[PDB]
């Protein structure tokens, strides 16, 4: 057999999200369908479907009121929190009050519906998960997720909840700066006391953290920064600068066409990125306003000057952080750049100048470091079952065939489509009865293609996939059914069996027990009894480890 | 060294039980093996073994007559009490008369046996204890247990007895509503007179209590409610509603198949829970009756209407409670939701409407609040030895290794298995003699694996664990021996030593004195003499505190 299924590491960001996995001695930051190693934390709702990530951020100009972003800022907070109310006047989507809990309110297929920030976030998570499963070729259940160090118990729990919704087992919620240091192996290289500063300049926020690490244990000493200072503000500057130039050169105002503004803003996003590895950046848009083309350029120097106040303002939070730790600049051993905006040579130069030309740790991609760290720690927690004598009888080799055909959630189901699929169900249960397993699978596929929203379809196909020694395939079908209806008992029964087939001991015991509560089977009952001693020996050993690292 | 062993807080419920612990500045409500933060108060007996909690509630449909629940209703009562006789006609297990004491009578491994309600309850307690010990990684002896405020001296003592059977030292029996208020810190926030109402809607019962708290002392002003109004009745409604719909849609009666009824009932339990956080709930069962699938849904609105009379009836006990306190609605400062059924938006709305849209205290999980309070008060009572100059010589660091291999109580011991284990005993006593301690432990483990019911095995292994500075491990073995045979003197001798090794002063003095009565040792005798001054200074200080709070 090959390796067990890996655990993923996820950076759930305010502006972008990022996922990694540790395999064959190294972390892989995973690229999504559109090719990018990071994904906008965006969810959009429309007339026909739900959009997530790049597709959601790209159509914003067209659908500004049902395109949700910045769910991280709401997460774990009260509608009555001054921060939320302060925030609500900058977003173009509606936020409503639900018993002192905030919910984003949108239009979605001609009906109004609302979502807790944990729900929005769980939609992002799901996407990240899906990105990883496409890379790996198999279903993922276990994750590590990161949060800012300033996150209270409320926001932490809320971030775990979002994971649980997206079908993840959350192994650990860990601090973003802590994730960064783990990435730079600042825990395992050292045999003495070292003090560490994480300069995190992201898309929406700026975070300075000083951490102390002795004996391989992280302790947060100070936190600071600005929860409203990010790369998105620099885009404002460029945008503001160019609108004004457009007035000057072309004698027209463009502020009021939203679509022309975005087109400018996205052009500016790209331009700012090029200005990190080039001194100059060209900027061409076909037909910006009333048929007028905009061809222009900008220099690094000029960009720097437009953001003048902003860039300089990242040294004050540094000053304040040392001040809270009771440390002098000289006393920090390690400087670490994370966040995508730290790609900006000026922002780099300013920091190095504060530390008198000392070397910055930046070999690890600054926008990938958090996820990187998260993946390493995910690998360690899973890795912990190495130390235990676990009997591996009954475990089989992971099936690797390509993902079977699923439904289409949003495709139109006709009245006749309900029946034709309904018949197929009965025809496939006959092939299982008779003993021709592939035929049973094949007609369930015709059933599912025709009715993609009947949850028993997926569960029953999953049953057949198990008889066929294809547990991953079953896990997939059960994952879908449980999405459609988390209350039906069948899918838990079969996912339990599938997990057990794969040595996923803790996963098997959760499902088989849940299946037994909802709908008692003698079989599942014994499966669970057979499964428990493995799950609790693993769980006890992981808990012990974490207690040792809680000190 | 780490912290001393914590005391647990236990909510011994009519329908569910719940355990918590206070550590590192906060209460942890502890999850059981199957993942749930609450455990059904169920004990089942069968052909081969004894089942407790979720496993007991899940197989009910299969074994209705030897599956015991509602022991709380019998506890502390006379067979001749009209309540018991009234109750006996709703249960499917047998209750018998034993000198005007009631005992539940069951089949258990092909023999008929009977159990006092305190014994049934002590089986639940044990489970809770075991849940906590798995979480903590070490044996627990000290607990706080909760009871309803209407409990007489008889029922209180009986509840303490059940704790004592399960091997707990019962620090305090405290009122459930009092536990709830302690959880909401309604004792320590206030510097004036405040009046408090606890609206407790559980699984079997409804409790309204009004409490007055000045100077940090709780006083019960009034009690009311219905000892037969709970969540289990709402399940009746849903079940009744669906059976009737099944007749209507599918032209068949299902009342007579018990297994189909339960499957419906458990489906309904889940559905009712979803209807707390969703307006609608889907309901799928594979093959309900004679091969017919039941796929159907229900709305929140509809559920509300089915329970119409029931929900509305919780305001009368409120009315009556104020009336007994001589208070108007306006005069209550604090409203507190506890009980799992208070998760129901309708039940919430009705209450708030009686108090004219005023805020309810519900931030603490309504089904976890009682246990929560109990854990806090457990922490205070233990915490009391902070104020005393206790000399800590001879105390060593708690051993944290994983739990050693125990027996299997219910596994079949062959005649040959008695001898092979018997030899191993003699072989291990030789390794102790010679001085190789691990070998002695290892061969006792082979002895125990082969004969899991000889109590001297466990005691002798415990002796070796002590020589090895692993007192927790010893405590475990002694706990087991004393379960098998509470009269043998050896285990008390060694548990005494182990406790003393850990600073468990009062625990050490109980065991060492009991060991000295049954079988006098010069060594244990001096251990006890050495141990007494510590135990009695602690005991005197806890007693004083409680006297101050008895006023
Ligand atoms: N090469 C680059 N040059 C300049 N800015 C960049 C570059 N790459 C990313 N950024 C900026 O970094 C921000 C995203 O930061 P990141 O750490 O990836 O996400 P988050 O802040 O959500 O954690 C965006 O504003 C983006 O414009
Ligand atoms: N989310 C929920 N929605 C509706 N009812 C619930 C929910 N959670 C628990 N309950 C109900 O609460 C009851 C258990 O109450 P609880 O306080 O936990 O136990 P006890 O009443 O034994 O003290 C059960 O009938 C259960 O159906
Ligand atoms: Mg970030
Ligand atoms: Mg209760």
What does it look like?
- The structure is a homodimer of 551-residue chains.
- With 551 residues, chain A is of the alpha+beta class.
- The first copy, chain A, has 4 domains: 1-189 and 362-397, ATPase, nucleotide binding domain (Nucleotidyltransferase, domain 5); 190-229 and 314-361, ATPase, nucleotide binding domain (Nucleotidyltransferase, domain 5); 230-313, Actin, Chain A, domain 4 (Alpha-Beta Complex), CATH 3.90.640; 398-551, Alpha Horseshoe (Serine Threonine Protein Phosphatase 5, Tetratricopeptide repeat), CATH 1.25.40.10.
- The first copy, chain A, contains 20 helices and 18 strands.
- In chain A, the strands form 5 sheets. In chain A, strands 1, 2, 3, 4, 11 and 12 form a 6-stranded mixed beta sheet that branches. A 4-stranded mixed beta sheet of chain A has the order 15-14-13-18.
- Chain A binds chain B through residues 455-456, 485, 487-490, 509-510, 513-514, 516-520, 522, 525, 532, 536-537, 540-541, 543-544, 547, 550, and chain B through 24, 33-35, 54-55, 57-59, 61-62, 134-135, 137, 262-263, 266-267, 270-271, 274, 281-286, 293, 295, 400, 402-403.
- One magnesium ion binds at residues 13, 202, 339 of chain A.
- The PDB classes it as chaperone.
- The entry lists the keywords actin-like fold, nucleotide binding domain, tetratricopeptide repeat, solenoid, Molecular chaperone complex, cytosol, Chaperone.
- The assembly is dimeric.
- The entry is titled "Crystal structure of a fusion protein containing the NBD of Hsp70 and the middle domain of Hip".
């Amino acid at each position: 057999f090959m390796a067990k299924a890996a655990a993923i590491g996820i950076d759930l960001g305010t502006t972008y999200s990022c996922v990694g996995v540790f395999q064959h001695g190294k972390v892989e930051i995973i690229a999504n369908d559109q090719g990018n190693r990071t994904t906008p934390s965006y969810v959009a709702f429309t007339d026909t479907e739900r959009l997530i990530g790049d597709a959601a951020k790209n159509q914003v100009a067209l659908n500004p009121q049902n395109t949700v972003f910045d769910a991280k800022r709401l997460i774990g907070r009260k509608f009555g929190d001054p921060v939320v109310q302060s925030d609500m006047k900058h977003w173009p989507f509606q936020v409503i009050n639900d018993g002192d809990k905030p919910k984003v309110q949108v239009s979605y297929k001609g009906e109004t519906k609302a979502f807790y920030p944990e729900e929005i976030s769980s939609m992002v998570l799901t996407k990240m998960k899906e990105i990883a499963e496409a890379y790996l070729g198999y279903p993922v259940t276990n994750a590590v997720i990161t949060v800012p160090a300033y996150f209270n118990d409320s926001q932490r729990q809320a971030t775990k909840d979002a994971g649980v919704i997206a079908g993840l087992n959350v192994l650990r919620i860990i601090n973003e700066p802590t994730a960064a240091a783990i990435a730079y192996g600042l825990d395992r290289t050292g045999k003495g006391e070292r003090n560490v500063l994480i300069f995190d300049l992201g898309g929406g926020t700026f975070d300075v953290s000083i951490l102390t690490i002795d004996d391989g244990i992280f302790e947060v000493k100070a936190t600071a920064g600005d929860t409203h200072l990010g790369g998105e503000d620099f885009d404002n500057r460029l945008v503001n600068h160019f609108v004004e130039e457009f007035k000057r050169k072309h004698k027209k105002d463009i502020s009021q066409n939203k679509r022309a503004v975005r087109r400018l803003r996205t052009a500016c996003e790209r331009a700012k990125r090029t200005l990190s590895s080039s001194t100059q950046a060209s900027l061409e848009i076909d037909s910006l306003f009333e048929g007028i083309d905009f061809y222009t350029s900008i220099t690094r120097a000029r960009f720097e000057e437009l953001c003048s106040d902003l860039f300089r303002s990242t040294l004050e939070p540094v000053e304040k952080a040392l001040r809270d730790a009771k440390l002098d600049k000289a006393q920090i051993h390690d400087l670490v750049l994370v966040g995508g905006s730290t790609r900006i040579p000026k922002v780099q130069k300013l920091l190095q100048d504060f530390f008198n030309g000392r070397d910055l740790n930046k070999s690890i991609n600054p926008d990938e470091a958090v996820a990187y760290g998260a993946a390493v720690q995910a690998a360690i927690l899973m890795g912990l079952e190495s130390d235990l004598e676990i009997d591996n009888e009954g475990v089989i080799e992971a099936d690797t065939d390509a993902p079977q055909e699923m439904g289409d959630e949003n495709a139109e189901i006709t009245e006749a489509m309900m029946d034709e699929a309904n018949e197929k169900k009965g025809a496939a249960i006959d092939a299982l009865n008779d003993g021709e397993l592939q035929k049973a699978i094949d007609l369930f596929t015709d059933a599912i293609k025709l009715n993609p929203r009947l949850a028993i379809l997926y569960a029953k196909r999953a049953s057949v996939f198990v008889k066929l020694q294809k547990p991953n395939a079953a896990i997939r079908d059960c994952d879908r059914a449980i999405e459609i209806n988390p209350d039906s008992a069948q899918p838990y029964k079969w996912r339990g069996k599938a997990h057990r087939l794969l040595g996923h001991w803790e996963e098997a015991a959760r499902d088989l027990a849940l299946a037994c509560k909802l709908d008692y089977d003698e079989d599942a009952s014994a499966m669970l009894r057979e499964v428990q001693p493995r799950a609790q020996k693993i769980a006890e050993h992981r808990r012990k480890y974490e207690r040792k690292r809680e000190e």
